[PDB]
Amino acid sequence: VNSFSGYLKLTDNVYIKNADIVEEAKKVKPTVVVNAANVYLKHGGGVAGALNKATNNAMQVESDDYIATNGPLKVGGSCVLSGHNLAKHCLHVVGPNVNKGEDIQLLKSAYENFNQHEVLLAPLLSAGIFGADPIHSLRVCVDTVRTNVYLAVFDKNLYDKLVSSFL
């Protein structure tokens, strides 16, 4: 039993809710919140910009030190950093950004990072400003993630479309 409330169940292990991931994290304080990161951990906009704003830029400060030490992530890769005031940990996951020409096949690799964590709050990878089809992102998620994932879809209209078209 966990504290996630109001989600629709899609599969044995995948759940979905129309919610602002920022407000959801502040309420549940999950062990892991997933960030829709880029390889430079520059959290300027989208989910990353919103999460970082909610940490009062502490996420960005920590991320800049991470990059200075380790260099950029790989597309499809991830790193675990602090969750600041939002979660115990933030799993920064880099899905391919279609608006940069990155191979959409890397989306499965990106979701595989979720399997290293028993329970996660997460956005749809490569959705929104990353330019991929969110229906496809949900499909890859369901077919790749085996751990318990609670998906927050900010857009109500997109949420309804995702549910109504889910196979």
Ligand X SMILES: O=C(O)C[C@@H](NC(=O)c1ncnc2[nH]ccc12)c1ccc(Br)cc1
Binding stretches for ligand X (CB under 6 A): 20-22, 36, 46-47, 50, 95, 123-124, 126-130, 152-155, 158
The whole-angstrom separation of Cα 37 and Cα 45 is 10
Interacting residues of 63 by C-beta distance below 8 A, sequence separation 6+: 41, 42, 43, 81, 92
Between 117 and 130, CB nearer to ligand X: 130
Taking every pair of Cα atoms in the chain, the longest distance, rounded to a whole number of angstroms, is 45
Name the token pair of 164.
């109504």
CB of 54 vs ligand X, minimal distance in Å: 9
CB of 43 vs ligand X, minimal distance in Å: 11
Between 81 and 124, CB nearer to ligand X: 124
CB of 158 vs ligand X, minimal distance in Å: 5
CB of 78 vs ligand X, minimal distance in Å: 13
Between 47 and 87, CB nearer to ligand X: 47
The whole-angstrom separation of Cα 48 and Cα 46 is 5
Between 20 and 112, CB nearer to ligand X: 20
CB of 131 vs ligand X, minimal distance in Å: 8
Measured from each CB, the residue nearest to ligand X is: 128
The whole-angstrom separation of Cα 157 and Cα 67 is 36
Q: Contact 80/90 with Cβ under 8 angstroms?
A: yes
Between 68 and 150, CB nearer to ligand X: 150
Amino acid at 53: K
